[PDB]
């Protein structure tokens, strides 16, 4: 059964990049809510799969993936931010990037682009192709997961749901993303990413 | 572990409406392909189940909704043929019908258009919504089934898949349509229909 | 070239169900934006129209619908808000209403379930089906209109972006739900539904 | 106006890989489909444009894409192909192939798989990345075109909407990717990689 995981900070270690009660209530609220969805929906399923109940897993298939990949992506969004965050990433990641996107630089307006392109609800990801052995930007919508839709490696999400935004920036999406630069644990996506390599 | 269905009929019991070369390979290939599918798919499924791999579960969707709708839809549409169908349905069910779509003329002609009208791959239905408490006309894609993807209780199916015309009436899916008609075994549609009254 | 309408009232006339900041934020940031972007790509589908060039006409789609539809959604809801609203409906609609849900409440019932049931941003409806000449509740992603994507004449439409409250309800999508009843503008409801006995 | 190309050789000049039967019905009707409807949805796009009917545009975006990509798709198609090619590409696209692929049989395997991955209809495709400046495979739903939906330029495209292969290889979808091969016209291919490099 899937469990909430505490945060490896405080609430408002993030601050003044993201303030303490955006951290509170997008944590101990929405995260908490698609754990809690995510453990109902997974029994429903196990039982329509005892039976041989074909239309009821389908129908449940919508709460799964949504859940499900809320609990994903917000458990990955966690281990990408800190408070020792902040400034670039260095050795082999670093490398990589100015590889595949000629520079950090270019890496940051490729992947905010990403971001503030998503209509409606969603997540701007960088990822790793295994198949093509290099990273790879992408954006999912509403809560759909990275690895279970596309198959690509999450090395750093960004948030773009309004509620990962709203009570500081409202309606300034490019604001927010400017600043979370700020907060961005590159020490944990250099891990996720040198798992990658192999 | 779900399995195919034999037919009600023999695989040339539906000419010169459907030649037996579409019910041969419609049946025995098509339908067979998407049984084995499922069950695969549902196997691995439980495994990701089991050790409580969301990113598993949500990468495995697409291949059970495919071919579990796969499963399904077929398993109906085998039901709502007969060589003992055509002509039109009596009793309450007919009644239904005049009710909500006016004539049992102007509803062939919703169904028809709802057929024709998919782009791509794709079912049209006749279904009883439940909650409304009447029939309702609706169109799924590919393999999504009516049921698990939109709630209403299916009643009668319409393959509108290339599969389901082409060695016979090529691209002209209009003929096909028109052609069908003289097959439609009404009184399964009944009992599906009354299952619904309650 | 389409314009942002004035609001039928002031910031403040919705309050304390729908705050003063929200409204201001929502009519002179969100929807202003909108209109610009449909505008700005209404232009761009016309020089593409004129040389024929397929590609761009589909590559503006994505922009046309969203900006459109949020513009098309948002002129709506503001009318169909005000000071003086509340209550139940007068008069036909609701009849209609007690004839389609049963009653009033099982109406707020399904028309809130469906609001809440939007899985990232989105829209409930209350509309009116054409063909079957009564009324039907649906749901929207982003800013898909209801006319545009699916037939029905939209009657009543409930914003579920998190934008849309946000600032007052935080993570609370269901006492934001239950705070709009109370100023619905029926009047307005009642003109749209009675457009469509044409 | 858009016009239905010639083809740049017989309806037999692909035998026995592609039939006669195939190419004259793919040609003369499915693609001579695609362009008339393409032709009626430009020009009932541009009264509601001249209008500014928001309403009526989002309504005919499914026509136009749908048709529109229709055209593109198989415009490029029937270029693809030659009864003088298949094998190996010369000069620098292989070398490509080789540098983002591994080598031209695991390029085959790739896009075969792609091919095959399709679940209802749709197209299979080698692309070119401009951002990334390199290859990449991908598919596209029904008639979605590749550049319009996704930005990559199309380099060679496989139809696998069952009117491709159904006439000659049944369901045996496989067996029709197998035979495409044998008739690639390497050059075509080349020339519209060669443009990318712009
Ligand atoms: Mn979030
Ligand atoms: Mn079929
Ligand atoms: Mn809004
Ligand atoms: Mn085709």
Redesign the interface.
Known sequence: ??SLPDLPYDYGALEPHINAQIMQ?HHS??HA?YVNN?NVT?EK??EA?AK?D??????L??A???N??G??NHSIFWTNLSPNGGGEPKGELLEAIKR?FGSFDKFKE?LTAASVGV????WGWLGFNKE?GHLQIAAC???D?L???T?LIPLLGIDV???AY??QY??VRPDYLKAIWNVINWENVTERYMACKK
């Not at 209509?119 to 969603?122: A, D, Y």
Request: charged residues 20%.
């Open positions: 059964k899937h209530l609220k929405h809510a995510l997974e399923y196990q799969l041989g074909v239309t009821a897993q389908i129908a298939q919508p799964l993936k949504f499900g990949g609990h994903i595949d490729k209509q409606g609800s969603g093509r919508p509403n809560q997961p690895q279970g839709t198959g749901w309004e509620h709203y009570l409202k309606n």
